[PDB]
Design an enzyme around this catalytic site. Sequence first.
Site, PDB file in Angstrom:
ATOM      1  N   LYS A  57       0.579  14.623   1.358  1.00  0.00           N
ATOM      2  CA  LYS A  57      -0.800  14.938   0.972  1.00  0.00           C
ATOM      3  C   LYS A  57      -0.878  16.418   0.586  1.00  0.00           C
ATOM      4  O   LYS A  57      -1.844  16.864  -0.038  1.00  0.00           O
ATOM      5  CB  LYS A  57      -1.763  14.702   2.135  1.00  0.00           C
ATOM      6  CG  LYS A  57      -1.716  13.320   2.761  1.00  0.00           C
ATOM      7  CD  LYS A  57      -2.692  12.370   2.128  1.00  0.00           C
ATOM      8  CE  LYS A  57      -2.834  11.109   2.983  1.00  0.00           C
ATOM      9  NZ  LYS A  57      -3.658  10.081   2.296  1.00  0.00           N
ATOM     10  N   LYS A  71      -8.653  14.232   4.861  1.00  0.00           N
ATOM     11  CA  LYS A  71      -7.814  13.033   4.837  1.00  0.00           C
ATOM     12  C   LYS A  71      -6.781  13.230   5.952  1.00  0.00           C
ATOM     13  O   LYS A  71      -6.701  14.309   6.536  1.00  0.00           O
ATOM     14  CB  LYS A  71      -7.088  12.925   3.493  1.00  0.00           C
ATOM     15  CG  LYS A  71      -6.166  14.096   3.216  1.00  0.00           C
ATOM     16  CD  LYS A  71      -6.501  14.801   1.905  1.00  0.00           C
ATOM     17  CE  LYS A  71      -5.958  14.082   0.667  1.00  0.00           C
ATOM     18  NZ  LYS A  71      -6.880  13.199  -0.153  1.00  0.00           N
ATOM     19  N   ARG A  72      -5.986  12.211   6.250  1.00  0.00           N
ATOM     20  CA  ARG A  72      -4.992  12.358   7.313  1.00  0.00           C
ATOM     21  C   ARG A  72      -4.006  13.489   7.009  1.00  0.00           C
ATOM     22  O   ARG A  72      -3.667  13.727   5.855  1.00  0.00           O
ATOM     23  CB  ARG A  72      -4.242  11.038   7.517  1.00  0.00           C
ATOM     24  CG  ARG A  72      -5.076   9.963   8.213  1.00  0.00           C
ATOM     25  CD  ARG A  72      -5.418  10.359   9.648  1.00  0.00           C
ATOM     26  NE  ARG A  72      -4.227  10.467  10.494  1.00  0.00           N
ATOM     27  CZ  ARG A  72      -3.824   9.538  11.360  1.00  0.00           C
ATOM     28  NH1 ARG A  72      -4.523   8.421  11.521  1.00  0.00           N
ATOM     29  NH2 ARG A  72      -2.721   9.731  12.077  1.00  0.00           N
ATOM     30  N   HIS A  96       0.773  -1.247   0.000  1.00  0.00           N
ATOM     31  CA  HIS A  96       0.000   0.000   0.000  1.00  0.00           C
ATOM     32  C   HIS A  96       0.806   1.300   0.000  1.00  0.00           C
ATOM     33  O   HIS A  96       0.234   2.363   0.212  1.00  0.00           O
ATOM     34  CB  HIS A  96      -0.937   0.044   1.211  1.00  0.00           C
ATOM     35  CG  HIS A  96      -1.958  -1.049   1.240  1.00  0.00           C
ATOM     36  ND1 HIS A  96      -3.221  -0.905   0.706  1.00  0.00           N
ATOM     37  CD2 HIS A  96      -1.906  -2.303   1.749  1.00  0.00           C
ATOM     38  CE1 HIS A  96      -3.905  -2.019   0.888  1.00  0.00           C
ATOM     39  NE2 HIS A  96      -3.130  -2.886   1.520  1.00  0.00           N
ATOM     40  N   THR A 115      -8.640   6.806  -1.696  1.00  0.00           N
ATOM     41  CA  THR A 115      -9.987   6.250  -1.810  1.00  0.00           C
ATOM     42  C   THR A 115     -10.997   7.362  -1.578  1.00  0.00           C
ATOM     43  O   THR A 115     -12.137   7.303  -2.065  1.00  0.00           O
ATOM     44  CB  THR A 115     -10.234   5.101  -0.807  1.00  0.00           C
ATOM     45  OG1 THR A 115      -9.814   5.500   0.498  1.00  0.00           O
ATOM     46  CG2 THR A 115      -9.480   3.859  -1.226  1.00  0.00           C
ATOM     47  N   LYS A 175     -14.802   8.519  -3.336  1.00  0.00           N
ATOM     48  CA  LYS A 175     -16.014   8.883  -2.602  1.00  0.00           C
ATOM     49  C   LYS A 175     -16.592  10.215  -3.093  1.00  0.00           C
ATOM     50  O   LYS A 175     -17.808  10.360  -3.237  1.00  0.00           O
ATOM     51  CB  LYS A 175     -15.711   8.984  -1.102  1.00  0.00           C
ATOM     52  CG  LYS A 175     -15.117   7.713  -0.506  1.00  0.00           C
ATOM     53  CD  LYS A 175     -14.756   7.884   0.962  1.00  0.00           C
ATOM     54  CE  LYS A 175     -13.918   6.702   1.445  1.00  0.00           C
ATOM     55  NZ  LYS A 175     -13.367   7.047   2.756  1.00  0.00           N
TER      56      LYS A 175
HETATM   57  C1  LIG Z   1     -12.032   7.273   2.819  1.00  0.00           C
HETATM   58  C2  LIG Z   1     -11.338   7.792   4.142  1.00  0.00           C
HETATM   59  C3  LIG Z   1      -9.963   8.038   4.217  1.00  0.00           C
HETATM   60  C4  LIG Z   1      -9.016   7.953   2.990  1.00  0.00           C
HETATM   61  O1  LIG Z   1      -8.973   9.229   2.356  1.00  0.00           O
HETATM   62  P1  LIG Z   1      -7.794   9.573   1.292  1.00  0.00           P
HETATM   63  O2  LIG Z   1      -8.046  10.959   0.881  1.00  0.00           O
HETATM   64  O3  LIG Z   1      -7.714   8.473   0.307  1.00  0.00           O
HETATM   65  O4  LIG Z   1      -6.496   9.550   2.206  1.00  0.00           O
HETATM   66  C5  LIG Z   1      -9.414   8.473   5.390  1.00  0.00           C
HETATM   67  N1  LIG Z   1     -10.179   8.659   6.493  1.00  0.00           N
HETATM   68  C6  LIG Z   1     -11.524   8.416   6.446  1.00  0.00           C
HETATM   69  C7  LIG Z   1     -12.325   8.451   7.759  1.00  0.00           C
HETATM   70  C8  LIG Z   1     -12.115   7.999   5.274  1.00  0.00           C
HETATM   71  O5  LIG Z   1     -13.500   7.856   5.219  1.00  0.00           O
HETATM   72  C1  LIG Z   2       0.150   2.490   4.393  1.00  0.00           C
HETATM   73  C2  LIG Z   2      -1.187   3.031   3.897  1.00  0.00           C
HETATM   74  O1  LIG Z   2      -2.070   3.323   4.693  1.00  0.00           O
HETATM   75  N1  LIG Z   2      -1.263   3.196   2.582  1.00  0.00           N
HETATM   76  C3  LIG Z   2      -2.495   3.661   1.951  1.00  0.00           C
HETATM   77  O2  LIG Z   2      -3.357   2.572   1.598  1.00  0.00           O
HETATM   78  C4  LIG Z   2      -4.621   3.056   1.079  1.00  0.00           C
HETATM   79  C5  LIG Z   2      -5.466   1.844   0.749  1.00  0.00           C
HETATM   80  O3  LIG Z   2      -4.810   1.006  -0.188  1.00  0.00           O
HETATM   81  C6  LIG Z   2      -4.361   3.958  -0.142  1.00  0.00           C
HETATM   82  O4  LIG Z   2      -5.575   4.401  -0.727  1.00  0.00           O
HETATM   83  C7  LIG Z   2      -3.484   5.148   0.266  1.00  0.00           C
HETATM   84  O5  LIG Z   2      -3.196   5.915  -0.897  1.00  0.00           O
HETATM   85  C8  LIG Z   2      -2.175   4.543   0.750  1.00  0.00           C
HETATM   86  O6  LIG Z   2      -1.385   5.640   1.217  1.00  0.00           O
END
Ligand SMILES: *Cc1c(COP(=O)(O)O)cnc(C)c1O
Ligand SMILES: CC(=O)N[C@@H]1O[C@H](CO)[C@@H](O)[C@H](O)[C@H]1O
EC number: 2.4.1.1
Lengths: 817, 817
Positions: free
Chosen positions: A554, A548-549, A357, A656, A660
């Site tokens: 990012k 996102k985190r 990942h 992901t 969404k």
């Molecule tokens: C879907 C989701 C993520 C992943 O978001 P990315 O922008 O792909 O990092 C992280 N936290 C929550 C609670 C989510 O619903």
């Molecule tokens: C280590 C880790 O959390 N990696 C993460 O895995 C998710 C699910 O595959 C990806 O969408 C994201 O881009 C990637 O940074």
Amino acid sequence: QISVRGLAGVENVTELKKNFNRHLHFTLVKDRNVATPRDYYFALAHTVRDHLVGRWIRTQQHYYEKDPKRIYYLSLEFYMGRTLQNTMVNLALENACDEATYQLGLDMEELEEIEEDAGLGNGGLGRLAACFLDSMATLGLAAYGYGIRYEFGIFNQKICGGWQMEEADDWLRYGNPWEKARPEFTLPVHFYGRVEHTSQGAKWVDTQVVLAMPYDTPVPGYRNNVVNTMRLWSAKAPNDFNLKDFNVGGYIQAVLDRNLAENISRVLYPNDNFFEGKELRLKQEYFVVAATLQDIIRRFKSSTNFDAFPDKVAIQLNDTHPSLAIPELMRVLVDLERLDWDKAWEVTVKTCAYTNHTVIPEALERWPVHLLETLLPRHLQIIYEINQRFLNRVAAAFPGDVDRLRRMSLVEEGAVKRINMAHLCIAGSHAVNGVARIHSEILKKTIFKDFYELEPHKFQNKTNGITPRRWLVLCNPGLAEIIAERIGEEYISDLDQLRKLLSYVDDEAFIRDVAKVKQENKLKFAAYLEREYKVHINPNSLFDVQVKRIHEYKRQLLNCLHVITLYNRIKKEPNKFVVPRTVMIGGKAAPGYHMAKMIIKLITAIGDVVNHDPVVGDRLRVIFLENYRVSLAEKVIPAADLSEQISTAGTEASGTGNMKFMLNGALTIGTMDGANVEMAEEAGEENFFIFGMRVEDVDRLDQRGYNAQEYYDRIPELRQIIEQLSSGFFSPKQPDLFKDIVNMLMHHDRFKVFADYEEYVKCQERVSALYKNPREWTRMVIRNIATSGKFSSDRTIAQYAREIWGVEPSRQRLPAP
Amino acid sequence: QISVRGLAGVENVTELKKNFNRHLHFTLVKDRNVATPRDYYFALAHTVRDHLVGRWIRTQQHYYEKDPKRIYYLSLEFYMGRTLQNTMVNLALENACDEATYQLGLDMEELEEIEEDAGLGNGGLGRLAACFLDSMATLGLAAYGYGIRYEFGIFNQKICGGWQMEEADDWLRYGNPWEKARPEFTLPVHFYGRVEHTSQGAKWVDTQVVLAMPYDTPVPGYRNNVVNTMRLWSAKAPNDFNLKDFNVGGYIQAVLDRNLAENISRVLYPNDNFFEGKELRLKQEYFVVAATLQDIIRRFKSSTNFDAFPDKVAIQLNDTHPSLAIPELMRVLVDLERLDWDKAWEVTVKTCAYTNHTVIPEALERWPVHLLETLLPRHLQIIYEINQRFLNRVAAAFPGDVDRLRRMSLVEEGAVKRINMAHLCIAGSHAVNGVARIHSEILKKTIFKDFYELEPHKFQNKTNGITPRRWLVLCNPGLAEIIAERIGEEYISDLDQLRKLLSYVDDEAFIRDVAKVKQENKLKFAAYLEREYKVHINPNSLFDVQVKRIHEYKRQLLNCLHVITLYNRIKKEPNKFVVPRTVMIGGKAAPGYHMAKMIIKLITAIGDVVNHDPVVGDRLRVIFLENYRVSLAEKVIPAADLSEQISTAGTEASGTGNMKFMLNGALTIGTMDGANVEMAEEAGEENFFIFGMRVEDVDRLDQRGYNAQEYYDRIPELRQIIEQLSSGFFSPKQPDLFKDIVNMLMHHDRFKVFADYEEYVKCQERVSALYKNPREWTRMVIRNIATSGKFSSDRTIAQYAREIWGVEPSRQRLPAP
Ligand SMILES: *Cc1c(COP(=O)(O)O)cnc(C)c1O
Ligand SMILES: CC(=O)N[C@@H]1O[C@H](CO)[C@@H](O)[C@H](O)[C@H]1O
Ligand SMILES: *Cc1c(COP(=O)(O)O)cnc(C)c1O
Ligand SMILES: CC(=O)N[C@@H]1O[C@H](CO)[C@@H](O)[C@H](O)[C@H]1O
């Protein structure tokens, strides 16, 4: 009541009300005179849970009878979120329950807000596991999710004085009605000890024992009456030795020290894409693996030639976190079942598959040898043997290539010896996959190039996806309804059908409904914002969202630079018209990630200035969304206009959240990174807001040498921003508060924020230009929603099943409840 | 099916079977194909629990409506034992459930054996609280038991190599179906901090906060539809400070350290009649008191003139363990409610009552001032003020008596300053009682003489009792039935009616039935012994039993001396006839009580010799009953012939096991100590086997000076025994194994074992002589059973209610379920 929410037919409603009152009385031991909203929430949860039990029992009986191949998804994270609504949706009970509670004089939506999120994950990785569980059940696979039952999940984020404050997520405080403790299936897990070599084999002795107690949670498929299981292990100390090791320090102390073994399942490490090599983390990783493998083998022996093991069992490793499954399987087969090494290895390889990942070096697990040496001595020996035999294979295929040998070794030499868990996973798995096409290619071209050359057949791609149940039907019923009105309900379990919507791009009626739903979602969210947190956003502005985190890759910082640019441009020409925007940024920073915490402070510091400047008015607002989590995502995503997916090209494996936003009617501004590439490919690049360097461009810059100073010298607007940050414009009482941020941007920015600034600002101007044309903005939205079908996790799981696990998905409904 | 077990009428049985299957499916999530005996036990428990809920809710609603005076029984121990059968008995569901399970193809008695004992007590004190709760509910008092929910109760005792081994009592492992968590009623408890004196009053600030979460357990009265509550507090760490105290050692560690505050309710101190001044114990004592008082006040403010507080509230302190209730009540009234000291004191005194349970100096609580000083600074100040005002009262009543002042002070001077909690309790309570007539007299004549002289009106007696539900109907249905056949069922809640049995002492039929029931109980127990533990007792021998905590004052050692005497007499004249006996001794020793552990080893060491001597045969057997607890007591007591109650006169405050044996058809051999005196008075001394020194005799001996050597020199049989112990006759491989025991008996025996030896042996010969005459032995038994009525805890509670609490007991049935 909307169509997609099911039927509310007389008999059903009457039955639900009856059982609701039954649980309120007998289960909660309360009467309508002293019951609180939480009591009502629980009575409803138990009532819905009841409808799940019957199907859960027969689904499992069914698997026992037909004995299909079983899929075990091992993960240290399962970010489930709330379960009530999801259960109703999948069982087609939403309207019935809505009516039943309505008649009882209760608002079901206010009851749903009482449920605590099951936050046993950090972000994308954990949520992916949750979407996968949903899809595996919907596709009728005999799948089991295996993880750890943390009593404390991801911390609840509080913002004090603009800074992030962390507080324990005591999610089990009021109990969890969804889980079922199964103490009868408790299994022992061994730690420490030493290895003894006897006449016939090695023996792992003098170990410390910790018990693994399983808790089962039901995972319902979408309207197919299939209910799979997610089994989470909880740590328990034995009643003996943890007290019977006499000649010591006292009875009371011995009992209190039990909370030394039980700490294993106490809390989730709050890191996202960052490896922390602590002993407690290693213990958690082995704990889940050891308990799970014994459970798998036990279930198998019921299904002793292990040659058929790979035909009845598939183990999927979510990242390297559960990588010890490989040497643990070998240990059991060789040490306990007495199989010859080669035979045991063949079985192990055919049983395990590994999903990578990330490519970020600081996220890769590399465990110090001394740690494994003391905690799992037998496993360390097995790992050395695996390495020895693997390197002999490499040496035979590439004679004389000595550097290749050291590059591919599972053992990393240096200041401290370490085991590269990723190399371990590739050697011991028959399939290795990336999570987006561009990521999987990078794995073969760079990070795992040597392995690809040795075994090209193992490498695959499985682009990520999200479940349309939780991320459309559940969180955006308004949209699901207008879609269903035109093409039916079949798309909910066959997202590709959304393509039919393409023939409605010119439909004046549809364009109006699509735009109407978005507006309602924004008003709904704008209200929630004030109801909770007292805030002032304007529903007419463009909702610019980045949730996102918090992480440097990012690039929340790039977003900040744009926000400041907009602010400065307004102050320069106050009376000029600009499309109004509400910029929303949210996400948690890992507790020990300094730069991430500084970024949060900057965001709130910018808001403090921008939100109280009379000249700006309601043209620009900067809000930091506190405690971003799954339940909050379900609220903000449907209300978004613009989705920010701006990671430096080549850093976001897939993403992901991007999927969404696409499914919910938001346009995307982003780099050609991760799944963004495939999303743009599906919708058409002219319907996406793409900008910045591509992976190739980033590489060139690195060959060249990245010098941020150059951009600072040639871009006046950028220079102004940096000078404002440095002089204390955003931190009057602490002029050098953001010195670290500036120093990083200027001298050691691994993610080249400045390199994409100009392109980013320009692209954002094009976004504002399109927003001015409601009709055209909405038509582009329709083209995105209509082509988001490929990103359903049902597609993803069907590919894992056919290309890795060797099993056929099924949409056949199980023989009723 | 026996009469006293209720009716098993068609409709009821059908309904029970239906609900049993309901819980097995929906609650346990199992089907008949995979259900284990434990699953069946739980389905039955939940089914019975359901019948309890309705009445529980209306009982509480009833108290709210009528608002009667409420009784709060504070105890750090509640030795409840099993709850299933007791609940069925009190609800009149035993035969119905027996039939219902029978029809389901299940043996209810084997299911009952699956339930774990709720061992939240050490022995007599904790079990008394349990019997009291039963009686208060049966007498319709609005009573609440308040204590701590230990996750680990009294340790499970294992005998290895003849030695006691302890292991954690993980009684909550499989869950507890009887309790109901009430997280919504969580209350904060403060520790540490400092006192600040402000303009208007003192303030306790900068404290550490620990949360008290209550768990409620229903306590059903006997067939009166009354269901009271026992509320047990559980410790929880707050989510903030226990993480929000920033600038420190890491997120993970902060979460793990939560198990520093939660340790408060982790485990029960395993001491019986022994004070251990550890900080954790003090924390437990304040924890229960602080949480309970806030709950009491809150409930009251619903019922602000606190002048009526004593009219609506009664607080009973079980020993000094909850003594901090006195200064805590004063703290709340003075510091928080702002009442003047004198007014607050008047309320406190009229609200609290204190029950003393021992005169043994090593059992009295005397807390070091430095401990209270650091943990509860405000309470220490309040205690000093109470002492100051109390001593001024003493000085005014006894002018110039300076030694009286130091003797009565709550503050004990010396090497280390200590607070005498007993003196605190007497000063702050309107009533002080002993637990048996002789004990209450000793309190006035010795230990509390000075206090009695100052306030004669406070001192009372409340002889202990046991509940006839658990200790007759439940554990000895056979006996309850033959009794009911003659005089009806009314005695179960009016034990005095057993006197009617006196007119059956010459009834040939009754004599035969009484003896028959005992024989059946002995065969039943003799079987259990082999089924579990593989042992060889003979059902025709006299069952000589001594079961209670191991302690030097209880004199298990005197019993041992007799056993060895019998053995030696047999070896001397092998072919002479002697009444066969099975001597059974059981009980737990506190983990840190060396001499107690040595006594257990001696008992098993004696058995090792006696049980394998060919010449002895089946004429004498010595068995050590492992893991003595409530559930085991329910089995062995009904099977006993001889009850050993041989404590040194003046040491056993009351004893309650003595009452249990009397009610179940065993004759008693004992000293004139505790309640033994009143038992002999009730049955007639010629129907009791009394021996040894009386309290007066012990005092004489102390004036004289106890010299064990004298008895050793003048009693040949005693000398022989000591020489056997010293030479290693009972420990071949360890000749001096029992040197400590001999040294103690010879030079520092505080309990004068030798002084009562001759009298004891002779009395035992008279017991053997009567056993030879079945008919006369049984007639004496009948006279004991017939006069045991006074020892029902219903009589005890009725006296507390009328003479201390100021409330009238009621036998009126509550308005149905
Ligand atoms: C879907 C989701 C993520 C992943 O978001 P990315 O922008 O792909 O990092 C992280 N936290 C929550 C609670 C989510 O619903
Ligand atoms: C280590 C880790 O959390 N990696 C993460 O895995 C998710 C699910 O595959 C990806 O969408 C994201 O881009 C990637 O940074
Ligand atoms: C009744 C009882 C006691 C008290 O027995 P005594 O002989 O009075 O000390 C102790 N333990 C248990 C389990 C009991 O049932
Ligand atoms: C401190 C303590 O447990 N004391 C005990 O209390 C019980 C119940 O009152 C008595 O029966 C027993 O004789 C006495 O020793």
